[PDB]
Design a protein around this ligand. Structure first.
Ligand code: HEM
Ligand SMILES: *[C@@H]1O[C@H](CO)[C@@H](O[C@@H]2O[C@H](CO)[C@@H](O[C@H]3O[C@H](CO)[C@@H](O)[C@H](O)[C@@H]3O)[C@H](O)[C@H]2NC(C)=O)[C@H](O)[C@H]1NC(C)=O
Ligand SMILES: *[C@@H]1O[C@H](CO)[C@@H](O[C@@H]2O[C@H](CO)[C@@H](O[C@H]3O[C@H](CO)[C@@H](O)[C@H](O)[C@@H]3O)[C@H](O)[C@H]2NC(C)=O)[C@H](O)[C@H]1NC(C)=O
Ligand SMILES: *[C@@H]1O[C@H](CO)[C@@H](O[C@@H]2O[C@H](CO)[C@@H](O)[C@H](O)[C@H]2NC(C)=O)[C@H](O)[C@H]1NC(C)=O
Ligand SMILES: *[C@@H]1O[C@H](CO)[C@@H](O[C@@H]2O[C@H](CO)[C@@H](O)[C@H](O)[C@H]2NC(C)=O)[C@H](O)[C@H]1NC(C)=O
Ligand SMILES: [Ca+2]
Ligand SMILES: [F-]
Ligand SMILES: [F-]
Ligand SMILES: [F-]
Length: 595
């Protein structure tokens, strides 16, 4: 008895079988169990969900029920006491480019998404929740503590709706609540091509047989393309400057326009497709619109994988890289490719790497204009800055020349993300990502810190002094303890991120384990992993090993000077070489001789 069945509300079709191209929804990868890794399924559970009433209520819901005999601290008070800081001076990561942070957010959005509950294409709940903070059904407000400034100017709470959950929708029972993953589990650039047929089609240019993606027809960037605008009205990107009226962009993943620098990456990727598409058409004049689409799409997914696994992971995990992700040994069909629930919180470490400003640089990498550098908080859902203020180049240079914020125990998340966040639904720039990240842990029903420490075979502290050693920080450990009473209750997000960083890495033991586990799993379980023999020919593989994020920039913007290693900190003149010195992708092995 497993309850094994629940395969209801989810899109399903026949397995193309023996087809050399990934299905959009992620289905048909695992032949013997077709729905593994597919979009719109439940986040996998490495450990049993822990809810207040065992079944679905989060801890904190019933204001009288304890978790391990203690009251869980209000999400925002954990923010105020531990996560906040004021001095942005000294904070930058001295050997990681702002692209380091940015790539993590791409990978993240390629792997997982637990959307919010709706139930109101018009309803008094998307207003009874924001206007009166009444807890009920899917409205689980973030109450403000006594003494929070925000009390004085904002209200009684920050509205917050519980995340979507499998099987049905409506008021639900039976089993433990499981959240949905509306995105595919495999590193496959689903953020560029979509997870859904439908949406996947919308994205395509099917007015012509060139196998191109749709591009904006209203604005251009020095003859280079932009992402299409969205049909959607209302539109937050429009609401951000009622005078300008520039809607959000349309991409394979709905979160694309959340911040300007993310929209930038999305558009460099689209560009890479179209570029690949044309080139392919040149070498093989007789290929299909579909054929061109899938083939470029396959080369692109191979790209996102190579940079992630060869260039990005080695530096998030550091020395702990070798221990969780041993060299590739072939596709294993028994390895479960599904993205676990805890990963979606483990991967949120990147939030502590986001700095407070964003720069635009001129051709010599000098401040572009008088208002070059801007507060990150005016950039949430900001699209007018790209379209009407220089385009992409000024913004990509910033990613290569600036640095990320470095995780620090006394400085965790910049106030830009911590007090001034713009949520696409409501009106202000007054939300808190750290309190939300904490509240979301409880909604998803996550086990405590020690449960995960135990899961990774690491010591489990039970007293102040024990927590002091694990964290190697005396004061931090005291605050955490005064708010939680026991480490067993410490929310995984704040717990995993409070640990000191491993050698050469950028996350601690617990996080290196949970991420390290996830990545080995989504690589060993992917039938279409690029090295998996039979997916790309040997000569094609040799061609792909030369890809670099640097070249991607050369071939897709008008930048002519770039670093060789793009994630490490690079100083301009000196660390920047001319594009000609950077290896190009030789698309010649993709040639097709008929006779
Ligand atoms: C500064 C720019 C960023 C903003 C404004 C931002 C904002 C957000 C917001 C609002 C959420 C959803 C909160 C909720 O309703 O639960 C979210 C989720 C998340 N963020 Fe970020 N984020 C940013 C950067 C990053 C980066 C750099 C990373 C990692 C390297 C990251 C990783 C994640 C992860 C893993 C999720 C959960 C995804 C899911 O399963 O749905 N974010 N972010
Ligand atoms: C700034 O970050 C750089 C990357 O973390 C780092 O340089 C890297 O150091 C590692 C470890 O010593 C080396 O890794 C590579 O070693 C051989 C070549 O030496 C390669 O064949 C392997 O693939 C392996 O990855 C590299 O020497 C180097 N990485 C690269 C890509 O150049 C610096 O240590 C950091 N700067 C400071 C001051 O610490
Ligand atoms: C809302 O979006 C507006 C653009 O979509 C933006 O206005 C634009 O920004 C500045 C003025 O704030 C102007 O830049 C400069 O333009 C000429 C050069 O061509 C100079 O001579 C001017 O002195 C000016 O500094 C843009 O041309 C301007 N356009 C308009 C119609 O005002 C606003 O800044 C945005 N404001 C908000 C609320 O975010
Ligand atoms: C889909 O089809 C073609 C692909 O090239 C696009 O039309 C060209 O775009 C520019 C628009 O300024 C012009 O040079 C011509 O009108 C077109 N040239 C060609 C090749 O005929 C069109 O933009 C594409 N539509 C979308 C949204 O992708
Ligand atoms: C494929 O991955 C699975 C997932 O871990 C592995 O299956 C294990 O096989 C070993 C035998 O070497 C057993 O002792 C383990 O208990 C199995 N674990 C699970 C979860 O099945 C295995 O490493 C891989 N299979 C092969 C032989 O390639
Ligand atoms: Ca994916
Ligand atoms: F600057
Ligand atoms: F503002
Ligand atoms: F060149």
């Amino acid at each position: 008895s497993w309850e094994v069945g629940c395969g209801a509300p989810v899109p399903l079709v026949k397995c193309d079988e023996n087809s050399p191209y990934r299905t959009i929804t992620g289905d048909c990868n695992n032949r013997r169990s077709p729905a593994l890794g597919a979009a719109n399924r439940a986040l996998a559970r490495w450990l049993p969900a822990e809810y207040e009433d065992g079944l679905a209520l989060p801890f904190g819901w019933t204001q009288r029920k304890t978790r391990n005999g203690f009251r869980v601290p209000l999400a925002r008070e954990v923010s105020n006491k531990i996560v906040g800081y004021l001095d942005e001076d000294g904070v930058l990561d001295q050997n990681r480019s702002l692209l380091f942070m940015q790539w993590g957010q791409i990978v993240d959005h390629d792997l997982d998404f637990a959307p919010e509950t709706e139930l109101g294409s018009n309803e008094h709940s998307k207003t009874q929740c924001e206007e009166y903070c009444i807890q009920g059904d899917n409205c689980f407000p973030i109450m403000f503590p006594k003494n929070d400034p925000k009390l004085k100017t904002q209200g009684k709470c920050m509205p917050f709706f519980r995340a979507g959950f499998v099987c049905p929708t409506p008021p639900y029972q039976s089993l433990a609540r499981e959240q949905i993953n509306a995105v595919t589990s495999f590193l496959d650039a689903s953020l560029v091509y979509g997870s859904e047929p439908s949406l996947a089609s919308r994205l395509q240019n099917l007015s012509s047989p060139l196998g191109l993606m749709a591009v904006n027809q209203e604005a251009w960037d020095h003859g280079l393309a932009y992402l299409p605008f969205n049909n959607r009205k209302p539109s937050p990107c429009e609401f951000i400057n009622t005078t300008a009226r520039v809607p959000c962009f349309l991409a394979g993943d709905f979160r694309a326009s959340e911040q300007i620098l993310l929209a930038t990456a999305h558009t460099l990727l689209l560009r890479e497709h179209n570029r690949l598409a044309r080139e392919l058409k040149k070498l093989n004049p007789q290929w299909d619109g579909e054929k061109l689409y899938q083939e470029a799409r396959k080369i692109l997914g191979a790209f996102v994988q190579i940079i992630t696994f060869r260039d990005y992971l080695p530096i998030v995990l550091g020395s702990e890289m070798q221990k969780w992700i041993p060299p590739y040994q072939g596709y294993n069909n028994s390895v479960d490719p599904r993205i676990s629930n805890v990963f979606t919180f483990a991967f949120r470490f990147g939030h502590m790497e986001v700095p407070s400003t964003v720069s635009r640089l001129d051709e010599n990498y000098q401040p572009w204009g008088p208002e070059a550098e801007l507060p990150l908080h005016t950039l949430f859902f900001n699209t007018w800055r790209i379209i009407k203020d220089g385009g992409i180049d000024p913004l990509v240079r910033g990613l290569l020349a600036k640095k990320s914020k470095l995780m620090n125990q006394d400085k965790m998340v910049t106030s830009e993300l911590r007090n001034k966040l713009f949520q696409p639904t409501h009106k202000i720039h007054g939300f808190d990502l750290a309190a939300i990240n904490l509240q979301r842990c409880r909604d998803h029903g996550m086990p405590g810190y020690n449960s995960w420490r135990g899961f990774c075979g690491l010591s489990q502290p039970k007293t102040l002094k024990g927590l002091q050693t694990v964290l190697k920080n005396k004061i931090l450990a005291k605050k955490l303890m005064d708010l939680y009473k026991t480490p067993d209750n410490i929310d995984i997000w704040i717990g995993g991120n409070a640990e000191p960083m491993v050698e050469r890495g950028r996350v601690g033991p617990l996080l290196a384990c949970l991420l390290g586990r996830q990545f080995q799993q989504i690589r060993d379980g992917d039938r279409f992993w690029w090295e998996n023999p039979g997916v790309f020919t040997e000569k094609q593989r040799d061609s792909l090993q030369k890809m670099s994020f640097s070249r991607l920039i050369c071939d897709n913007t008008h930048i002519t000077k770039v670093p060789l290693h793009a994630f490490q900190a690079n100083n301009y003149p000196h660390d920047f070489v001319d594009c000609s010195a950077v290896d190009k992708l030789d698309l010649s092995p993709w040639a097709s001789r008929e006779n």
